[PDB]
Design an enzyme around this catalytic site. Structure first.
Site, mmCIF file in Angstrom:
data_model
loop_
_atom_site.group_PDB
_atom_site.id
_atom_site.type_symbol
_atom_site.label_atom_id
_atom_site.label_comp_id
_atom_site.label_asym_id
_atom_site.label_seq_id
_atom_site.Cartn_x
_atom_site.Cartn_y
_atom_site.Cartn_z
ATOM 1 N N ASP B 320 33.326 -32.196 -10.055
ATOM 2 C CA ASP B 320 32.769 -31.364 -8.971
ATOM 3 C C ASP B 320 31.470 -30.757 -9.486
ATOM 4 N N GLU B 367 30.690 -35.969 -7.695
ATOM 5 C CA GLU B 367 30.572 -35.211 -6.429
ATOM 6 C C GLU B 367 29.094 -34.794 -6.351
ATOM 7 N N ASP B 420 38.608 -29.936 1.430
ATOM 8 C CA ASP B 420 37.728 -28.850 1.934
ATOM 9 C C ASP B 420 37.440 -29.043 3.454
HETATM 10 O O1 LIG Z 1 29.600 -13.409 -4.117
HETATM 11 C C1 LIG Z 1 30.404 -14.317 -3.340
HETATM 12 C C2 LIG Z 1 31.912 -14.010 -3.459
HETATM 13 C C3 LIG Z 1 32.244 -13.398 -4.829
HETATM 14 C C4 LIG Z 1 32.368 -14.400 -5.983
HETATM 15 O O2 LIG Z 1 31.241 -14.248 -6.874
HETATM 16 C C5 LIG Z 1 32.492 -15.869 -5.522
HETATM 17 O O3 LIG Z 1 33.195 -16.613 -6.530
HETATM 18 C C6 LIG Z 1 33.236 -16.042 -4.208
HETATM 19 O O4 LIG Z 1 34.609 -15.791 -4.581
HETATM 20 C C7 LIG Z 1 35.939 -16.051 -4.725
HETATM 21 C C8 LIG Z 1 36.270 -16.391 -3.256
HETATM 22 O O5 LIG Z 1 36.025 -15.208 -2.478
HETATM 23 C C9 LIG Z 1 37.717 -16.874 -2.973
HETATM 24 O O6 LIG Z 1 37.763 -17.428 -1.636
HETATM 25 C C10 LIG Z 1 38.158 -17.913 -4.007
HETATM 26 O O7 LIG Z 1 37.454 -19.159 -3.689
HETATM 27 C C11 LIG Z 1 37.571 -20.502 -3.511
HETATM 28 C C12 LIG Z 1 37.017 -21.248 -2.272
HETATM 29 O O8 LIG Z 1 37.269 -20.373 -1.159
HETATM 30 C C13 LIG Z 1 37.697 -22.599 -2.045
HETATM 31 O O9 LIG Z 1 36.954 -23.370 -1.084
HETATM 32 C C14 LIG Z 1 37.800 -23.405 -3.355
HETATM 33 O O10 LIG Z 1 36.530 -23.901 -3.724
HETATM 34 C C15 LIG Z 1 36.372 -24.986 -4.490
HETATM 35 C C16 LIG Z 1 36.343 -26.235 -3.603
HETATM 36 O O11 LIG Z 1 37.602 -26.469 -2.950
HETATM 37 C C17 LIG Z 1 36.009 -27.401 -4.528
HETATM 38 O O12 LIG Z 1 35.930 -28.612 -3.760
HETATM 39 C C18 LIG Z 1 34.714 -27.101 -5.332
HETATM 40 O O13 LIG Z 1 33.578 -26.859 -4.431
HETATM 41 C C19 LIG Z 1 32.246 -26.632 -4.853
HETATM 42 C C20 LIG Z 1 31.476 -27.994 -5.140
HETATM 43 O O14 LIG Z 1 32.126 -28.833 -6.156
HETATM 44 C C21 LIG Z 1 29.980 -27.770 -5.428
HETATM 45 O O15 LIG Z 1 29.141 -28.946 -5.473
HETATM 46 C C22 LIG Z 1 29.374 -26.824 -4.335
HETATM 47 O O16 LIG Z 1 29.311 -27.379 -2.975
HETATM 48 C C23 LIG Z 1 28.451 -26.667 -2.126
HETATM 49 C C24 LIG Z 1 26.920 -26.920 -2.189
HETATM 50 O O17 LIG Z 1 26.389 -26.533 -3.454
HETATM 51 C C25 LIG Z 1 26.141 -26.186 -1.100
HETATM 52 O O18 LIG Z 1 24.854 -26.767 -1.055
HETATM 53 C C26 LIG Z 1 26.749 -26.407 0.277
HETATM 54 O O19 LIG Z 1 26.627 -27.800 0.741
HETATM 55 C C27 LIG Z 1 27.099 -28.153 1.985
HETATM 56 C C28 LIG Z 1 26.014 -27.954 3.022
HETATM 57 O O20 LIG Z 1 25.470 -26.604 2.957
HETATM 58 C C29 LIG Z 1 26.539 -28.332 4.438
HETATM 59 O O21 LIG Z 1 25.462 -28.199 5.405
HETATM 60 C C30 LIG Z 1 27.020 -29.796 4.448
HETATM 61 O O22 LIG Z 1 25.930 -30.733 4.234
HETATM 62 C C31 LIG Z 1 25.793 -32.000 4.693
HETATM 63 C C32 LIG Z 1 24.958 -31.983 5.996
HETATM 64 O O23 LIG Z 1 25.622 -31.200 6.983
HETATM 65 C C33 LIG Z 1 24.771 -33.402 6.572
HETATM 66 O O24 LIG Z 1 23.998 -33.343 7.790
HETATM 67 C C34 LIG Z 1 24.200 -34.304 5.466
HETATM 68 O O25 LIG Z 1 22.875 -33.887 5.072
HETATM 69 C C35 LIG Z 1 21.776 -34.666 4.974
HETATM 70 C C36 LIG Z 1 21.089 -34.858 6.348
HETATM 71 O O26 LIG Z 1 21.888 -35.561 7.296
HETATM 72 C C37 LIG Z 1 19.757 -35.601 6.221
HETATM 73 O O27 LIG Z 1 19.081 -35.522 7.484
HETATM 74 C C38 LIG Z 1 18.889 -34.982 5.102
HETATM 75 O O28 LIG Z 1 18.368 -33.651 5.455
HETATM 76 C C39 LIG Z 1 17.085 -33.328 5.067
HETATM 77 C C40 LIG Z 1 16.119 -33.741 6.218
HETATM 78 O O29 LIG Z 1 16.085 -35.168 6.367
HETATM 79 C C41 LIG Z 1 14.676 -33.249 6.019
HETATM 80 O O30 LIG Z 1 13.923 -33.477 7.229
HETATM 81 C C42 LIG Z 1 14.635 -31.766 5.605
HETATM 82 O O31 LIG Z 1 15.003 -30.910 6.740
HETATM 83 C C43 LIG Z 1 15.094 -29.707 7.400
HETATM 84 C C44 LIG Z 1 16.248 -29.520 8.414
HETATM 85 C C45 LIG Z 1 17.441 -30.401 8.011
HETATM 86 O O32 LIG Z 1 18.587 -30.053 8.778
HETATM 87 O O33 LIG Z 1 16.705 -28.156 8.548
HETATM 88 C C46 LIG Z 1 15.720 -27.195 8.952
HETATM 89 O O34 LIG Z 1 15.170 -27.471 10.251
HETATM 90 C C47 LIG Z 1 14.608 -27.134 7.905
HETATM 91 O O35 LIG Z 1 13.485 -26.492 8.525
HETATM 92 C C48 LIG Z 1 14.163 -28.478 7.274
HETATM 93 O O36 LIG Z 1 13.936 -28.253 5.866
HETATM 94 O O37 LIG Z 1 15.433 -31.595 4.392
HETATM 95 C C49 LIG Z 1 16.845 -31.885 4.535
HETATM 96 C C50 LIG Z 1 17.665 -31.627 3.253
HETATM 97 O O38 LIG Z 1 16.909 -31.821 2.050
HETATM 98 O O39 LIG Z 1 19.608 -34.911 3.838
HETATM 99 C C51 LIG Z 1 20.853 -34.179 3.838
HETATM 100 C C52 LIG Z 1 21.556 -34.334 2.469
HETATM 101 O O40 LIG Z 1 21.756 -35.733 2.240
HETATM 102 O O41 LIG Z 1 25.025 -34.326 4.268
HETATM 103 C C53 LIG Z 1 25.328 -33.058 3.663
HETATM 104 C C54 LIG Z 1 26.448 -33.241 2.640
HETATM 105 O O42 LIG Z 1 26.040 -34.150 1.603
HETATM 106 O O43 LIG Z 1 27.936 -30.092 3.403
HETATM 107 C C55 LIG Z 1 27.746 -29.556 2.079
HETATM 108 C C56 LIG Z 1 29.183 -29.487 1.474
HETATM 109 O O44 LIG Z 1 28.925 -30.149 0.252
HETATM 110 O O45 LIG Z 1 28.128 -26.025 0.281
HETATM 111 C C57 LIG Z 1 28.990 -26.626 -0.685
HETATM 112 C C58 LIG Z 1 30.265 -25.745 -0.558
HETATM 113 O O46 LIG Z 1 31.120 -26.581 0.214
HETATM 114 O O47 LIG Z 1 30.096 -25.549 -4.258
HETATM 115 C C59 LIG Z 1 31.508 -25.651 -3.902
HETATM 116 C C60 LIG Z 1 32.052 -24.205 -3.926
HETATM 117 O O48 LIG Z 1 31.469 -23.540 -2.785
HETATM 118 O O49 LIG Z 1 34.761 -25.870 -6.071
HETATM 119 C C61 LIG Z 1 35.022 -24.786 -5.173
HETATM 120 C C62 LIG Z 1 34.833 -23.496 -5.976
HETATM 121 O O50 LIG Z 1 35.777 -23.646 -7.006
HETATM 122 O O51 LIG Z 1 38.311 -22.738 -4.527
HETATM 123 C C63 LIG Z 1 38.022 -21.366 -4.723
HETATM 124 C C64 LIG Z 1 39.417 -20.884 -5.038
HETATM 125 O O52 LIG Z 1 39.428 -20.409 -6.309
HETATM 126 O O53 LIG Z 1 37.935 -17.525 -5.382
HETATM 127 C C65 LIG Z 1 36.737 -16.815 -5.794
HETATM 128 C C66 LIG Z 1 37.113 -15.774 -6.867
HETATM 129 O O54 LIG Z 1 37.373 -16.525 -8.044
HETATM 130 O O55 LIG Z 1 32.750 -15.164 -3.153
#
Ligand SMILES: OC[C@@H]1C[C@H](O)[C@@H](O)[C@@H](O[C@H]2[C@H](O)[C@@H](O)[C@@H](O[C@H]3[C@H](O)[C@@H](O)[C@@H](O[C@H]4[C@H](O)[C@@H](O)[C@@H](O[C@H]5[C@H](O)[C@@H](O)[C@@H](O[C@H]6[C@H](O)[C@@H](O)[C@@H](O[C@H]7[C@H](O)[C@@H](O)[C@@H](O[C@H]8[C@H](O)[C@@H](O)[C@@H](O[C@H]9[C@H](O)[C@@H](O)[C@@H](O[C@H]%10[C@H](O)[C@@H](O)[C@@H](OC%11[C@@H](CO)O[C@H](O)[C@H](O)[C@H]%11O)O[C@@H]%10CO)O[C@@H]9CO)O[C@@H]8CO)O[C@@H]7CO)O[C@@H]6CO)O[C@@H]5CO)O[C@@H]4CO)O[C@@H]3CO)O[C@@H]2CO)O1
Ligand SMILES: OC[C@@H]1C[C@H](O)[C@@H](O)[C@@H](O[C@H]2[C@H](O)[C@@H](O)[C@@H](O[C@H]3[C@H](O)[C@@H](O)[C@@H](O[C@H]4[C@H](O)[C@@H](O)[C@@H](O[C@H]5[C@H](O)[C@@H](O)[C@@H](O[C@H]6[C@H](O)[C@@H](O)[C@@H](O[C@H]7[C@H](O)[C@@H](O)[C@@H](O[C@H]8[C@H](O)[C@@H](O)[C@@H](O[C@H]9[C@H](O)[C@@H](O)[C@@H](O[C@H]%10[C@H](O)[C@@H](O)[C@@H](OC%11[C@@H](CO)O[C@H](O)[C@H](O)[C@H]%11O)O[C@@H]%10CO)O[C@@H]9CO)O[C@@H]8CO)O[C@@H]7CO)O[C@@H]6CO)O[C@@H]5CO)O[C@@H]4CO)O[C@@H]3CO)O[C@@H]2CO)O1
Ligand SMILES: [Ca+2]
Ligand SMILES: [Ca+2]
Lengths: 523, 523
Positions: B320, B367, B420
């Site tokens: 991440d 990521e 998410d």
């Molecule tokens: O202070 C505060 C407080 C205290 C403390 O300190 C702290 O710590 C806190 O605490 C605590 C708490 O309270 C509790 O609750 C507990 O916690 C927790 C939580 O709750 C849960 O959730 C968990 O977490 C975890 C998770 O699960 C895991 O997964 C991990 O996560 C993380 C990650 O890994 C990293 O990386 C980060 O993420 C982030 C980022 O950084 C930021 O940035 C954000 O992002 C986002 C955004 O914002 C949104 O919006 C979305 O996006 C997207 C869009 O929508 C679509 O549409 C697409 O885009 C694209 C487009 O389509 C195209 O078109 C292009 O655009 C461009 C254009 O073309 C051109 O033309 C320009 O423009 C413009 C316009 C546009 O619209 O606008 C206006 O009009 C202006 O004027 C102009 O400028 O440019 C543009 C741009 O360049 O392109 C684009 C791109 O391709 O696609 C996209 C996507 O890709 O989505 C995103 C999502 O990603 O946010 C994010 C967030 O989500 O971070 C994260 C965190 O946050 O890890 C985590 C943490 O661990 O767990 C925990 C439990 O433990 O606890 C504590 C105590 O310890 O509070």
């Protein structure tokens, strides 16, 4: 960038991912200019070429693909074939627009024939009607003294043009005068290009040679106007180059050491393909083969010139049988079938390095269909050339079939089908029931009545950066509109857009393509 | 290969294109083991883990993704969060199966609680019920003298295990005894790890430490049985590693020089993200940041060990906030918001070169969501790590949105949505009308009632080599089944497969997934 852990500049987050314009997603239409409608028995580089380009622009297409533009086959078993060129570098004079020559004042309105039957090209009558008119226009140009005369003189003397045109003109003149099946049987002074014999040909065949050159100029000028108009509408033109050339051509006769010929100029070994999982016999093509070892010694000068001419005509082009550059099948010339040959090592990447050094970056498409070897794939990727996917080939094996959309890659060209395939509707009509249900399951159980939209959308929604549709599939046509059935000798290359269809009547078809181009990011 | 123009071997055409098994197309299900059904208030590594793996195998899935398996948050505002780990290397003892401990003879059937309410994990009651039972099992193991005792001793003394486990055990013991908010306020001999103070902790906290180690052994043994069974069914397990660790952990306390701390052990700068096109405020996360310069000096030994433990648990894993390895946002620890920070240069590729040298090839998923910079993309490609596509993010901009299937690449992982995101049905329910019609147009005007099949098929038919579906989407569930709503502090991480659903009742769901895996080449 600074040392690890030090500050980046304040503007760091403005350095957004780079998008190479060479990766832009694009759509095109396959339409050979012979297929344009009009009243003169064959399509031409005249009014209809501009109307087509306007329709492409209205449809949002940014590419137009054509077959080779060379002077085609005149033998009775390949009449009209773009793949039986008399010459690799010349343009087909039958594509010259009689109407554009009237605009130039090289023909009179009065000399144009009455409207001719419009639906199919008749290759057995079209030369007898057009040839005398193009000859007449060339003679009027040769005797003129204005702007067009100066342009003719600049064309004739251009070093890239003269490098192929002089040899093509003298070849055609000797062929016309001597009239043997091949140059192998020419009188020795002409067969072996005695300097003195060639000077006497120009004395005795001067009018033939000047006319041949003026016709090539009239082709060049018409094609450059089409290509300039295309560019003005954001359209690139993709051509087509067969890897091999024909024996009976200036290409071989004026460049004998580039080919594997014996001491009398007869081919030692000829082209083809061996049997594989899909063919019991393989194919004997019978073209002469390149002396790749001798070519490497002069920096592949013959291939460099061939590519220079191609970039003069086209923004980009397909090379047919690209696999020949890695490895090629060679049959001893005395043999009548393909089985008794051998694989030879092709030139590989150094040919492409020499082309890059002499001409700069070129956009080549690798025709890489059928059973190919890992060295073919390695060569293609090493030069970053796209390969091909063809949707008509995708549905008859298992899910690892490379033509299925989930197996496509970004650097690839996807077709519904090429000039060698039936139209989508024709293919569907003869397709086994088991393959049909497989097609319908894959496209997410779409209705059989919508097969054309299904395959067109499957090409346009592909990750492949170029998608190409045949014009016949946009017009909803069946098997009667097929451009070629491989290995048949009649009724090929003759399809035209019919007289009842005009580009100004195709707004709905343009809009329907443009909407899917918008959805799948090809605008 | 021979010289250009020479013969290839007779067998040339047998050298067919190479297919790297690292490129195999695969499908997986995202399901955290807490979500398994059963009678003990939370899912565990017991009978239901094996039943799930059988269902995955019946569905033709070859991957199972989990969230971090670390001991989660105990503060009232992150109760149960896998992303508020007490430790980067330990396993969550709440995932230990009471039933597997009865099989081992470490618990009696009589000591298991009566069936508990089955539909949601209650994080405020589950520790009070399970903790005493796991402690009881650990004490019976510590006083035993058979096979399991020998395995405990081998685990405890293993150099890779002891490198994190000893520090984690002593940390937990001191934390339990001293009970300050953070180790920053521990008595100086414990805060600064006086050798003599640490020897006295083992004397006074021996039973706590031996029990902590035996619990980690019972986790390890259960998890290894799950992973062995998975492998037996062709299933890889993909884990999840947050780039940063928490301040109040053995990770920081026993490795202070790996972090940017002042002379009293307080963080100088902390993690977050600045404002961008999608956030006015950015985010203050407040983790300590790595001293990447000092890490480079010892060959990134701390990161190498973290990766070694991860490969002990998982075949492959997501990191991440992968973008932190190229560049990371650093806020002075005294600041209360994100805006007042700076980008620093991450370690880049040398971290990955040191990992490859010490551990060999690892399968990391980057990521790489949100606004990232070209150096992030360059780093990811330089180590050939796949990035992520998420279909729920694809339909709200234009056709260049990288989450749309026509923009996917082969070396990528595609999700319908992650832990998410809402479920597909929940996302659909709150989606604006304009985005909905856009979704329906893109999937080729599919019916709104079929949105789930539409998005699942859109992930499975992608060129992305891995497609992942949340279990909630296979079961057709709405917003009530969402695993997490980011930035909320109640009702997260508690979804379970309900008591009325059992893996032996899901044959139809397995068959429906397996058929699309077959069509799109993921079997
Ligand atoms: O202070 C505060 C407080 C205290 C403390 O300190 C702290 O710590 C806190 O605490 C605590 C708490 O309270 C509790 O609750 C507990 O916690 C927790 C939580 O709750 C849960 O959730 C968990 O977490 C975890 C998770 O699960 C895991 O997964 C991990 O996560 C993380 C990650 O890994 C990293 O990386 C980060 O993420 C982030 C980022 O950084 C930021 O940035 C954000 O992002 C986002 C955004 O914002 C949104 O919006 C979305 O996006 C997207 C869009 O929508 C679509 O549409 C697409 O885009 C694209 C487009 O389509 C195209 O078109 C292009 O655009 C461009 C254009 O073309 C051109 O033309 C320009 O423009 C413009 C316009 C546009 O619209 O606008 C206006 O009009 C202006 O004027 C102009 O400028 O440019 C543009 C741009 O360049 O392109 C684009 C791109 O391709 O696609 C996209 C996507 O890709 O989505 C995103 C999502 O990603 O946010 C994010 C967030 O989500 O971070 C994260 C965190 O946050 O890890 C985590 C943490 O661990 O767990 C925990 C439990 O433990 O606890 C504590 C105590 O310890 O509070
Ligand atoms: O002698 C003879 C005679 C005489 C002389 O000499 C000669 O010359 C001739 O003549 C003449 C004539 O007569 C007249 O007519 C004229 O002519 C002409 C013509 O006609 C026309 O047409 C024209 O032509 C032209 C054209 O147009 C152009 O375009 C060009 O062409 C060319 C090109 O370029 C080149 O390249 C070539 O091609 C070719 C090739 O080579 C071959 O090979 C073939 O191919 C094909 C195939 O065969 C088929 O089949 C298809 O394929 C496909 C498939 O189907 C699908 O399915 C896919 O595949 C895949 C799959 O899917 C997967 O699965 C895989 O497979 C594999 C597996 O996996 C494994 O397991 C294994 O297995 C097996 C199984 C399987 O199935 O089977 C069995 O069971 C067994 O046991 C086992 O083994 O393995 C496998 C494999 O490895 O994979 C795969 C692959 O991926 O896909 C595919 C595709 O890709 O398709 C293809 C097509 O391509 O064929 C071709 C042909 O087409 O060549 C060509 C030519 O031909 O050029 C041309 C020429 O120029 O023009 C002309 C006019 O001028 O004239 C003359 C006088 O002068 O006669
Ligand atoms: Ca003749
Ligand atoms: Ca406490």
């Amino acid at each position: 960038v600074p040392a690890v852990g030090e500050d980046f500049p304040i503007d760091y987050a403005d350095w957004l991912p780079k998008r190479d314009p060479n990766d832009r997603r694009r759509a095109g239409i396959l339409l050979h200019p012979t297929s344009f409608p009009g009243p003169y028995g064959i399509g031409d580089l005249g009014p209809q070429a501009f109307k087509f380009l306007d329709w492409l622009h209205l449809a949002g297409c940014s590419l137009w693909q054509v077959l080779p533009l060379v002077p085609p086959g005149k033998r009775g078993n390949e009449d009209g074939s773009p793949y039986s060129g008399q010459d690799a570098n010349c343009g087909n004079t039958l594509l010259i627009s009689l109407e554009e020559l009237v605009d130039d004042g090289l023909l009179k309105m009065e000399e144009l024939p009455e409207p001719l039957p419009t639906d199919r090209v008749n290759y057995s009558t079209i030369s007898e009607i057009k040839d005398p008119l193009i000859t007449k226009a060339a003679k009027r140009l040769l005797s003129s003294e204005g702007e067009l005369k100066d342009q003719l003189e600049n064309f004739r003397r251009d070093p890239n043009i003269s490098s192929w045109l002089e040899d093509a003109a003298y070849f055609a003149a000797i062929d016309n005068s001597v009239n043997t099946i091949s140059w192998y049987d020419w009188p020795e002074p002409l067969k072996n290009r005695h300097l003195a014999a060639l000077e006497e040909v120009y004395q005795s065949e001067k009018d033939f040679i000047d006319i041949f050159i003026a016709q090539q100029f009239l082709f060049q000028r018409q094609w450059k106007k089409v290509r300039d108009y295309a560019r003005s509408k954001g359209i690139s033109i993709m051509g087509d180059m067969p890897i091999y050339v024909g024996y009976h051509s200036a290409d071989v006769w004026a460049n004998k050491k580039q080919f594997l010929l014996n001491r009398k100029g007869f081919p030692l070994i000829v082209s083809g393909v061996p049997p594989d999982a899909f063919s019991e016999t393989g194919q004997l093509w019978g073209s002469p083969l390149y002396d790749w070892k001798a070519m490497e010694k002069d920096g592949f000068s013959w291939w460099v010139r061939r590519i220079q001419r191609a970039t003069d005509l086209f923004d980009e082009f397909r090379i047919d049988h690209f696999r020949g550059f890695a490895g090629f099948w060679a049959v001893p010339s005395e043999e009548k079938i393909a089985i008794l040959g051998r694989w030879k090592v092709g030139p590989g990447k150094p040919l492409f390095d020499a082309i890059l050094q002499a001409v700069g970056k070129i956009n080549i498409i690798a025709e890489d269909l059928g059973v190919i070897t890992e060295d073919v794939v390695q060569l293609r990727k090493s030069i970053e050339a796209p390969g091909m996917a063809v949707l008509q080939f995708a549905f008859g094996s298992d899910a690892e079939n490379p033509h299925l959309p989930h197996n496509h890659e970004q650097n690839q060209v996807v077709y519904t089908g090429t000039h060698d395939n039936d139209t989508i509707r024709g293919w569907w009509d003869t397709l086994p029931q088991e393959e049909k249900s497989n097609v319908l399951k894959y496209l997410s159980n779409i209705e059989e009545e919508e097969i054309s939209r299904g395959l067109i959308e499957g090409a346009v929604s592909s990750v492949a950066r170029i998608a190409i549709i045949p014009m016949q599939d946009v017009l909803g046509l069946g098997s009667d509109s097929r451009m070629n059935i491989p290995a048949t000798q009649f009724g090929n290359w003759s399809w035209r857009i019919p007289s009842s269809t005009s580009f100004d009547n195709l707004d709905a078809e343009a809009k329907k393509l443009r909407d899917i181009l918008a959805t799948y990011g090809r605008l």
